[PDB]
Design a protein around this nucleic acid. Structure first.
Length: 226
DNA sequence: CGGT
């Protein structure tokens, strides 16, 4: 899930999670408009502090000072809660990245065909994230990662891993500062949306170029024309 | 010492 779409208005995503009384997020009617969100950019990221939900632009990537490789963008659910690298983020840096769906590239010979994957029921996805607090500092090296899970059922035809997508109810619980890392592991297990709830289709190869951010990038295409 |  090295690219995803976050294109609609803030209210389109937030309405499933909390009413205004629980938010500390200014009203803004403008669609976010990003059909092709990429690592290393700042992404509007949802988290809880001071008993309210906050939305901060946070760098997608995590590279502490001792990390001498490109920033990581994912953390595996199987191990993140106990990892020497990710455990503190799992405990105190949990967050949600909302989106319309995500992209994966299926290997087809020596070519790579992108697909867009989304909920068949038409709800946005609430992707489980972990990251470096305080998020509001706007760090350009230590931001957030999207937690991943194994692909299952039809999804394995496309790619072997997928974002850990949570139900709206589980997403709200995941963010709470009062719940422990162990309770968060329980939420990740119980709230994960199963593979059979997703649909997908091939999309234009144009999504590979981050200059492109338009709505056509999520439209179904004939693979033969690419 | 720490990963996808």
């Amino acid at each position: 899930c090295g690219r995803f779409a976050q294109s609609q208005t803030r209210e389109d995503y937030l309405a499933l999670l909390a009413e205004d009384i629980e938010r500390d997020i200014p009203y803004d009617p403008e669609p976010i408009g990003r059909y092709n969100v990429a690592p290393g950019t700042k992404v509007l990221l949802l988290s809880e502090r001071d008993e309210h939900l906050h939305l901060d632009p946070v760098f997608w990537g995590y590279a502490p000072g001792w990390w001498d490789k490109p920033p990581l963008i994912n953390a595996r659910v199987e191990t993140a809660a106990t990892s020497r690298m990710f455990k503190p983020l799992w405990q105190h840096g949990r967050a949600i990245c909302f989106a319309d769906g995500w992209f994966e590239w299926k290997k087809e010979g020596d070519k790579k065909q992108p697909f867009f994957i989304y909920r068949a029921d038409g709800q946005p996805i609430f992707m489980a994230a972990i990251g470096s607090t305080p998020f509001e500092r706007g760090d350009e090296a230590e931001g957030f990662l999207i937690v991943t899970a194994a692909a299952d059922q039809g999804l394995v035809d496309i790619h072997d891993r997928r974002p850990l997508v949570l139900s709206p109810e589980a997403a709200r619980e995941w963010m709470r500062q009062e719940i422990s890392g162990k309770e968060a592991s329980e939420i990740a297990a119980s709230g994960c949306v199963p593979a059979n709830q997703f649909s997908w289709h091939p999309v234009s190869r144009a999504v590979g170029n981050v200059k492109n951010q338009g709505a056509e990038l999520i439209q179904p295409v004939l693979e033969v024309l690419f």
